[PDB]
């Protein structure tokens, strides 16, 4: 039964599921992001007062790996939470029509900003499009970090390189990845705040995009 199938999608992801996301984003999520930005700031200042010898190419710094892991967990959580809100709106996109589309345009505009959050801000895709990657760092930053660091380490460790800028680059890879988290977290905070305001102003038309009973006909 068709209407029963629709009723079950809708009962399973309701305004309450999406509201609970928004609640969590206003409080716990923003606090966490602030926590990560501090750790990245702290980590960045450590590297700034540092001279790097070949010993630095011999050990991968656990403090940075952990800042980045923590950032990744958070991104992961935001992505799944955004998908919940996306689901709530998307299963309430009404029958396709060439009229009565004002609630629908609200649904499209909120979905578009969630797309941006998930695709641009969180860099979740495996290939970015023709508008590159706007966010300072994405979901797979840890792997970007390790891959960059290890090309240098490997060039510096054995028969190794005598390039003095290569040695400085290793330190610069460490510093920049901490900075990129500081930047990424600020940017994410803006997006998350923009989405809270957008959802809370628009939630009624997100849920019921058409309220359509006329008295004109009988």
């Amino acid at each position: 039964k068709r209407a029963a199938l629709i009723q079950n999608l809708r009962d399973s992801y309701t305004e309450t599921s999406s509201f609970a996301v928004i609640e969590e984003w206003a409080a716990g999520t923003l606090q966490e992001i602030e926590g990560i930005a501090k750790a990245a700031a702290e980590a960045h200042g450590v590297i700034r007062n540092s001279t790097y010898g070949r010993a630095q190419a011999e050990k991968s710094p656990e403090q940075l790996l952990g800042v980045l892991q923590r950032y990744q967990d958070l991104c992961h959580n935001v992505y799944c939470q955004a998908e919940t809100i996306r689901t709530v709106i998307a299963i309430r996109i009404p029958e396709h029509k060439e009229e009565d589309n004002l609630g629908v345009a609200v649904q499209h505009a909120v979905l578009k900003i969630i797309d941006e959050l998930e695709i641009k801000t969180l860099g979740s895709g495996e290939k970015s499009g023709s508008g590159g990657a706007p966010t300072p760092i994405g979901m797979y930053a840890l792997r970007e970090y390790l891959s960059a660091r290890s090309t240098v380490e490997d060039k510096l460790l054995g028969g190794g390189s005598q390039s003095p800028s290569l040695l400085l680059e290793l330190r610069q890879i460490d510093a920049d990845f901490m900075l990129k988290v500081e930047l990424a977290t600020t940017h994410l905070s803006t997006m998350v705040r923009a989405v809270i305001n957008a959802y809370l102003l628009n939630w009624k038309k997100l849920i019921q995009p058409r309220t359509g009973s006329d008295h004109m006909v009988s």
């Binding site: 029509k97 060439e98 009229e99 009565d100 006329d214 008295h215 004109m216």
Partner: protein, 222 residues
Amino acid sequence: ITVFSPDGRLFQVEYAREAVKKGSTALGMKFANGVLLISDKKVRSRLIEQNSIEKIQLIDDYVAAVTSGLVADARVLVDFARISAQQEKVTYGSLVNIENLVKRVADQMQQYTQYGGVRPYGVSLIFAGIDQIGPRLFDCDPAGTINEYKATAIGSGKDAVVSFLEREYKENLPEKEAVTLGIKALKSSLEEGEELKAPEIASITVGNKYRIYDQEEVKKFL
């Protein structure tokens, strides 16, 4: 403005109905051998003169209207209704069935949804009075759709007032109790912690002309 959408809707008429939703709340209800009207007033400030621009408008001694939506558009329909009432009284000596008057007003509104070069009136009206059939209560919307009621409401608090009356409304109340119920239904539509300032009230019973409750008459209810 006079155009059908693929689903057969008149969007300009539907947009005119949006304007009506911003108006202040009013209601009417029939009671025992009678009918009444109560209007909320969005009172600006103490600089506004209150004796004035009444929400409840008598059309003749036996008939009154209350409106919601565009205030200038409403004033034009209320003038139209007064004159239209007088034209029937001149023609036949009296006004036998109030529903023909409401139909004349509703026809004029219907036309402004069918001819180009004008917009619809952004107005809904409730008419209440006594005729040969007895006490009457109609409403009329920007399309010129009309219904006869036992009890009804227009304006922003419409849905609240209507749901209240749908649970609370009883036929043939004595006037005192009709009025009290009406005040209750209005309060129901208010935002929590918001205070009913003091509405307009007016009633008519068979055999009589309309009475407009004065400020201290309304006080015994507030």
